[PDB]
Design a protein around this ligand. Structure first.
Ligand SMILES: NC(=O)C1=CN([C@@H]2O[C@H](COP(=O)(O)OP(=O)(O)OC[C@H]3O[C@@H](n4cnc5c(N)ncnc54)[C@H](OP(=O)(O)O)[C@@H]3O)[C@@H](O)[C@H]2O)C=CC1
Ligand SMILES: NC(=O)C1=CN([C@@H]2O[C@H](COP(=O)(O)OP(=O)(O)OC[C@H]3O[C@@H](n4cnc5c(N)ncnc54)[C@H](OP(=O)(O)O)[C@@H]3O)[C@@H](O)[C@H]2O)C=CC1
Lengths: 323, 320
């Protein structure tokens, strides 16, 4: 019931075009339909790869849904010209006439939001995208946006893509109530905390080993460390690992499995609202493993309580869902 | 620089009219000017007492009141008007300086409520509009609706804020700054928990009569603040006060209030204020003295931060 969307951030980075195409195929073979990319992902290479799969995206002949995003970074603003330019470039790369979902990837605090939204309204009138989404906007910024659109008679956003996992729940307090009021569904990213919730790291890895991956050896590693790589977060993971052992003994699932099942079975995400989890991977084996976990059932209550105890351990230092 | 407002919730409850009048006098004698009451306080007795003090309220003294949605009164237009007009009669004044929506009415579209406030403002029944207990996102909706409709915007938000209760800092404070609302803090001592006068185990045996026991709102207040981790937090601050100042240490009450005036997100430059609470004149006088004390040693400010981190996972919601 809670849906799954395929994250394509690693396509064109760790995953070459063949690996990416196998990934999409595995995802589709499980009955899922929706793909998440962005103007910025692997410097345009993610969209380019997806556009070359012969899926016929944006066409009436297409069962696959595609989402992309414009961003304000590196001096591109979210001023009208920049929003148009990014979307049109995305359309060329994806080799499609319109995308199913277009996001504002993160806020442009230098550009009045009414300007940006007027550009989105116009681009929607032109048939460049079907639905509008927001990502990384505060609840109060979402409300302002929705209220402006209603009063101007513009397209409202209908999807919010936000940071959410078993140990990162800031979104629950104010954002989820706001979204319910304005009618936005929620797609969760960082569902394994960039990989921290696989249990494959030790806190001390940051001094010696520094294993190349999401948290080391790239341009966003330090952002990810600051987001999730905290001692209390490792204590939290250990707490959940111990609960899995105690509740299931020899038959215990992986912590990865458990962390994803939390999302689909025990989070505030509701299939009734059209909510979804955006799965991440840097390889096809990781993806296949994750897809298996999505088809697993609920967890023992003690493990759910453990995850809650885990969140309480880190809630004081939760990263902001907004930027 | 951070201002002080007098909370009048106890006027007509633990404080009779003479004690209340002496309280107002002590407050005004310190140079302060602003009083906070509400339609609901002591079943209308708070406003009535204030209205009988001959202060001429609609003038150096400023008065705020609030309409609420509770007990089946909605915040539908008729209810808003009816509450304000009754408050005006009780306060014996033609207009109030600040009128709040006390808490959200989730059964009534907010645009209805706001149109009523616009009309009542046009009539000169109140000068400024305030909000209390609305989420940051609800404040943003409201401000955006008022701008588009050409109506009076709210300019004051009255919210729950103290050294161990800081949920408002994350989203609400940024929102307020953007829309130009000043912030007035209530529960600055966590209803009295931050005086250090209680032990967690008081809930079992002693149950001392006061904010937390023996009355209709005690259970709400226990659910809000009466948590083991909160008492751990208080003890941590008391230990830091002993360490930092030794024999010269201030009271934890004095410290908690100085935090608000000197070390919180409240800014005098924005017109922000603390709403002082008391259930007696001695309490008030002790609290007023703390407002005139200076900043705290860094180590105590850090201890307060450590204390907040202890309780942040179970912080009560600032919105309703
Ligand atoms: N709107 C926004 O600001 C955001 C949008 N997104 C979108 O959401 C998608 C998902 O988020 P993402 O953060 O990638 O998801 P995750 O939290 O699941 O992190 C995924 C990473 O964790 C590791 N991992 C995943 N599965 C396994 C496994 N089974 N075993 C071992 N390691 C595993 C891999 O990292 P590694 O092997 O490198 O160590 C993978 O790259 C993205 O692809 C993107 O489309 C993502 C971030 C921000
Ligand atoms: N808009 C809203 O929803 C809210 C508005 N308010 C307003 O804010 C004002 C202040 O809030 P309030 O919670 O009262 O503020 P506090 O957090 O300071 O709580 C005040 C209570 O703490 C105790 N106390 C205060 N000073 C001392 C002292 N020096 N020594 C020992 N105990 C002390 C007394 O309780 P005890 O009975 O135990 O003696 C007093 O009644 C209220 O009067 C009201 O006007 C208040 C709450 C909600």
């Amino acid at each position: 019931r809670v849906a799954s969307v395929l994250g394509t951030m690693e396509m064109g980075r760790r995953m070459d075009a063949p690996a990416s195409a196998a990934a999409v195929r595995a995802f589709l073979e499980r009955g899922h339909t929706e793909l998440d990319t962005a103007f910025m992902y692997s410097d345009g290479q993610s969209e380019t790869i997806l556009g070359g799969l012969g899926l016929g995206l944006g066409g009436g002949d297409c069962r696959v849904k595609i989402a992309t995003k414009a961003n304000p970074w590196d001096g591109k603003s979210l001023k009208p010209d920049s929003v148009r330019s990014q979307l049109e470039t995305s359309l060329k790369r994806l080799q499609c006439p319109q995308v199913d979902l277009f996001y504002l990837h993160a806020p442009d605090h230098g550009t009045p939001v009414e300007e940006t939204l007027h550009a989105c309204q116009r681009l929607h009138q032109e048939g460049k995208f079907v639905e509008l989404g927001l990502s990384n906007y505060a609840s109060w910024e979402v409300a302002e946006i929705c209220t402006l659109c209603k009063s101007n008679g513009w397209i409202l956003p209908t999807v919010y893509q936000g940071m959410y996992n078993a140990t990162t729940r800031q979104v629950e307090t104010e954002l989820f109530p706001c979204l319910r009021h304005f009618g936005l569904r929620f797609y969760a990213y960082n569902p394994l905390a960039g990989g921290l919730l696989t249990g494959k790291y030790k806190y001390e890895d940051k001094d010696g080993k520094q294993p190349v991956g999401r948290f080391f050896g790239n341009s966003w590693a330090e952002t990810y460390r600051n987001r999730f790589w905290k001692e209390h977060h490792f204590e939290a993971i250990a707490l959940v690992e111990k609960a899995l052992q105690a509740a299931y003994g020899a038959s215990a699932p992986s912590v990865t499995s458990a962390a994803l099942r939390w999302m689909y079975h025990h989070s505030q995400l509701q299939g009734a609202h059209g909510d979804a989890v955006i799965l991440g991977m840097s390889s096809l084996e990781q993806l296949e493993q994750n897809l298996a976990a999505t088809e697993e059932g609920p967890l023992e209550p003690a493990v759910v309580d453990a995850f809650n105890q885990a969140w309480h351990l880190v809630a004081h230092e939760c990263p902001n869902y907004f930027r």
